[PDB]
Amino acid sequence: MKVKSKPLTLYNVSGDRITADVHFVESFLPAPVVIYSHGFLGFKDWGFIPYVAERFAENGFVFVRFNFSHNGIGENPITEFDKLAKNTISKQIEDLTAVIEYVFSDEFGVLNDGQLFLLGHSGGGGISIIKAVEDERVRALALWASISTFRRYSKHQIEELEKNGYIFVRIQVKIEKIVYDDFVENSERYDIIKAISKLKIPILIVHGTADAIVPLAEAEKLRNSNPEYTKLVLISGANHLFNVKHPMEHSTDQLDKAIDETVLFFKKIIENKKAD
User: CA-based Rg of the chain, rounded to a whole angstrom?
Assistant: First the structure.
């Protein structure tokens, strides 16, 4: 079977340009749409994202990946450090909103069944939970190593932010104060734990037991806030990136379990809708 890959250029309401791709296998259409969101420090063409896109397409999904309008990608698919420094949670949400609206627009030329499922990794999981609350057209959510709070900054980092106007985060990237200001001035709207408790759609929480970036405790906090609609799946010995190396030359047991658990979870939702 041939996995087709098509480039998309879309804009958010501020006119910020978003570059995206859609992977699909024609023989599976009409199929559900899966929008994948990565964290602040991630890129659609890096790590396991291309392989994940290929696998979801091979499993009967219309998989969309995108880069944030302010994630620094300008000419090479980092050349825009001014914009990356100002990639607030509000801009990331605005970008995800434009991708969802592009998929639901007449401009999306990929024959689908109208079902929108979100998949978020790390920071992208947080952005996906907020978005799922804001838009009831998201009928299922899967989270891979997702954060449980946007309040990631330490006592020290916040202190340098208020003194210098920016901080560096590891290859160091400058994050301007506006990113912290945007979370704090919108902490209720962006309260991940509160948002996930409001959801009434199936939620899959995939997390590794050897994850040192976002501990297993955070995955259990997400599950604890909505025990009715969530399912917690533990990947034994998996780190924050499902044990994949960079450059990615092959997949791991860990990443294949996350993909299969997600595919089956999404597939049971489609099958249950047909049963009604």
Answer: 18
Contact 262, 204 (CB under 8 A): yes
> What are the tokens at 227?
């025990």
Q: b/e for 222-236, b at 16 or more Cβ within 10 A?
A: bbebbeebbebbebe
In the three-class reduction of DSSP (H, G, I as helix; E, B as strand; rest coil), residue 118 is classed as: strand
Tell me whether strands 203-208 and 138-144 are parallel, antiparallel or unpaired. parallel
Packed helices 89-103 and 123-134: angle between N→C axes, nearest 10 degrees: 60
Nearest to 234 by CA among 257, 214, 253: 257
* Contact status, residue 19 vs residue 67, Cβ threshold 8 Å: yes
Resolution (Å units):
1.9
How open is the CA angle 127-133-138, to the nearest 5 degrees? 85
> Measuring CA to CA, which residue among 90, 38, 27 is closest to residue 62?
27
Length of the chain: 276
Tell me the C-alpha distance between 212 and 12, whole Å.
Answer: 34
- Experimental technique for the deposited model: X-ray
Residue 112: HSE in the Cβ half-sphere, 13 Å Cα cutoff: 26
State the burial class of residue 114 (Cβ atoms within 10 Å of its Cβ: 0-12, 13-18, 19+). Answer: exposed
| Domains of the chain and any CATH numbers | 3-275 (3.40.50.1820)
The single-letter code of the amino acid at 32 is: P
- Cα separation of 15 and 18, whole Å? 9
Q: Check the chain for breaks (C–N over 2.5 Å) and list the residue before each, or none.
A: 77, 170
